[PDB]
């Protein structure tokens, strides 16, 4: 009859989903939100020893968060709904045997454009943003890796780089784009588009879905230099009290019906193979949510960097102050 603390991202859980859980197990659930990975990191180390029961890291911190000792074993016997998941994205180097995380939701990130103002054909690559004709109008996301795995793919490099000469090549070149940025949004990157202030910039593909299910033509033009891909996973912090409760919520989000009701409303691609079929012809078909096999292999996934994490971050926080 205890309760759990669920610390998650901005727009994953839709209103009503956690109300279902309570009337089924008697457990009450309190909910909070992130905006990025660095904010999640700092929160867990200040209020150490038992502040939360279920974090949602990105996969490229599941390796980092292991060695500091903030994740623990996941008992894999009571998680009796694991099978329905896609075996494709189920054994990757960061967590070999899946004793530390369970895939939750993946997604992409490409150029967004507004049809009523700018032609979706006048921009086709990351380099078109550096043009001096877009001074003071460009929305950019607020994640260190995303903002950096755009200049690296512009000059031509591997996004997963651990070399202090290419990272320092990014900063010097990414610091000429700042005269064009107007906002740094990572909570709902669709609002400046839907309010009428920005008309060109980075956008998450799932958020553009929600703005097309309302009134606005936001088109996700893929860039020729690639496309930024990522995935998120569920984890249990080391010192938690509702150890049983944390498992019983992951076992509820792996169900097919639960995972499709949320997947249709928010539009973020689901890694649940069982529910990947039971879907609408507008959600499970659109080229921007679920793409071909030619685009996923033309852009780079977000892998671990290791100990050059600080260099990416420390340069980022100086780029903002301009």
């Amino acid at each position: 009859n205890n309760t759990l603390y669920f610390y998650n991202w901005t727009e994953y859980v839709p209103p009503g989903l956690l109300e279902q859980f309570t009337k089924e197990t008697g457990i009450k659930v309190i909910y909070s939100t992130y905006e990025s990975n660095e904010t999640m990191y700092a929160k867990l180390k200040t209020y150490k020893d038992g502040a939360y029961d279920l974090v949602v890291p990105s996969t490229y911190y599941v390796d980092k968060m292991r060695k500091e000792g903030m994740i623990q074993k996941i008992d894999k016997s009571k998680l009796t709904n694991f099978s329905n998941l896609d075996p494709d994205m189920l054994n990757k180097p960061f967590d070999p045997n899946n004793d530390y995380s369970i895939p939750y939701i993946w997604g992409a990130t490409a150029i967004g454009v507004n049809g009523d103002a700018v032609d979706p054909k006048s921009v086709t690559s990351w380099a078109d943003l550096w043009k001096p004709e877009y001074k003071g109008s460009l929305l950019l996301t607020d994640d260190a890796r995303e903002v950096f795995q755009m200049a690296l793919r512009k000059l031509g490099y591997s996004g997963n780089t651990t070399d202090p000469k290419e990272i320092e090549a990014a900063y010097n070149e990414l610091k000429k784009l700042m005269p064009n940025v107007a906002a740094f949004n990572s909570d709902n990157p669709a609002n400046p588009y839907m309010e009428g202030e920005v008309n060109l910039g980075m956008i998450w593909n799932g958020s553009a879905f929600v703005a097309r299910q309302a009134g606005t033509p936001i088109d996700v033009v893929w860039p020729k230099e690639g496309g930024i891909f990522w995935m998120d996973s569920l984890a249990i912090p080391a010192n938690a009290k509702n150890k049983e409760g944390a498992l019983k919520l992951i076992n509820f989000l792996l169900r097919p019906d639960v995972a499709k009701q949320v997947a249709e409303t928010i539009g973020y691609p689901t890694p649940n193979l069982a529910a990947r079929k039971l879907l609408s012809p507008e959600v499970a078909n659109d080229k921007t949510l679920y793409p071909d096999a030619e685009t996923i292999k033309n852009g780079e996934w977000q892998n671990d960097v290791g100990a050059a994490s600080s260099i990416y971050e420390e340069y980022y926080q100086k780029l903002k102050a301009g």
Partner: protein, 249 residues
């Protein structure tokens, strides 16, 4: 007149965004830029929202506790200043003035370092102490300014007539001060409701309160349950102002 036009504008400037958060409460678009019909869905959706209801409950309990204790201590201090005259009185007046003229961000960071050095976990108690700390001066000023409009010779006259030091409090000083004691409790209740800077620093995950939960939703900007929760707290605030006047007299 154009003099009335000047006063009409300033009130309209301050009152336009309030009407918007009422009009958009019954709006049906989940975003709020235009008007798309009438609905009462949002209130019902609020009634089931567990997290936001718990947060509102914590806000109300903390406001009540902080306001009560601040009123008590500040009222006693104002009695102490009015009744007695010593050498350090101008110094204490200056201390209170400087405390009241103080930035809130500095207070937040200072209380953070203080609670970190001593070793008290962040949660209920820290928020209580911070709220009392920045609510005291207004209570003190209100009660003291109320009492300063009466003759002090009453107390000597009461002593000459054969009265103890405790009977003066029950029969003379307290009746003259109740109309300002109540105005301090309501003023302290108001601040502890909409305080954001201090709470964002000196509370933890355990005890969550409304400014922090509203902050996330306002940045995401998709849930008009927030607009509906605001209009309830305005009605509940206007009944205390009325109820206080009846009880105070």
């Amino acid at each position: 007149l154009l003099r009335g036009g000047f006063m009409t504008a300033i009130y309209a400037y301050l009152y336009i965004p309030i009407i918007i958060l009422i009009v958009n409460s019954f709006n049906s678009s989940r975003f709020g830029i235009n008007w798309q019909g009438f609905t009462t869905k949002w209130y019902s959706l609020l009634m089931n929202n567990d997290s936001l209801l718990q947060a509102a409950q914590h806000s109300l309990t903390m406001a009540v506790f902080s306001a009560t204790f601040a009123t008590l201590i500040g009222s006693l201090t104002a009695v102490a200043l009015y009744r007695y005259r010593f050498r350090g009185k101008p110094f204490v007046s200056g201390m209170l003035f400087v405390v009241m003229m103080s930035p809130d961000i500095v207070m937040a960071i200072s209380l953070l370092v203080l609670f970190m050095l001593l070793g008290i976990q962040l949660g209920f108690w820290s928020l209580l102490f911070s709220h009392i700390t920045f609510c005291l001066p207004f209570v003190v000023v209100t009660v003291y300014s109320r009492l300063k409009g009466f003759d002090v010779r009453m107390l000597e006259a009461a002593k000459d007539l054969g009265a103890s030091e405790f009977t003066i409090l029950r029969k003379i000083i307290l009746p003259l001060a109740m109309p300002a004691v109540a105005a301090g409790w309501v003023l302290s209740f108001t601040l502890s409701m909409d305080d954001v800077v201090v709470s964002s620093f000196v509370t933890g995950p355990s005890y969550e309160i409304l400014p922090l939960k509203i902050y996330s939703m306002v940045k995401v900007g998709v849930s008009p349950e927030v607009n509906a929760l605001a209009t309830i707290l305005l009605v509940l605030s206007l009944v205390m102002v009325i109820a206080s006047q009846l009880i105070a007299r």
